């Protein structure tokens, strides 16, 4: 379950593919909760890469369903995250997963 809510401005055509290692300022957020998680805060923009099962699933779908420039907003569904065992003190069992995520990629 990962539904996209596009804040439009990019270019829409450079996707992410296989093999390729891609930048993210992603930005955590509970519903109907406060914040988690920020690599804005850090100011290391976590570079990871694409199909090697690093990132969670949820993560994983909507980086490739984004491109250049791009910002989009994540929902995440309990059962592609965490929701059966829960990040042990910072994520609760069934929880439900909101992200800012804006893509500022190389490669």
């Known amino acids: 379950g990962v539904e996209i809510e596009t804040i439009s401005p990019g270019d829409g055509r450079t ?43 949820g993560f994983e779908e909507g980086a490739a369903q984004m491109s250049l ?5 994540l929902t995440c569904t309990p059962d592609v995250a965490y929701g059966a ?3 042990p003190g910072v994520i609760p069992p069934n929880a439900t997963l909101i992200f800012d995520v804006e893509l500022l990629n190389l490669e």
């Open 15 to 57: 996707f992410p593919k296989k093999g390729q290692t891609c930048v993210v300022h992603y930005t955590g957020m509970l519903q109907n909760g406060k914040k988690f998680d920020s690599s804005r805060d850090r100011n290391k923009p976590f570079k990871f890469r694409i199909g090697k099962q690093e990132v969670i699933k």
């Open 69 to 73: 420039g791009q910002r989009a907003k």
């Open 85 to 87: 065992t829960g990040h």
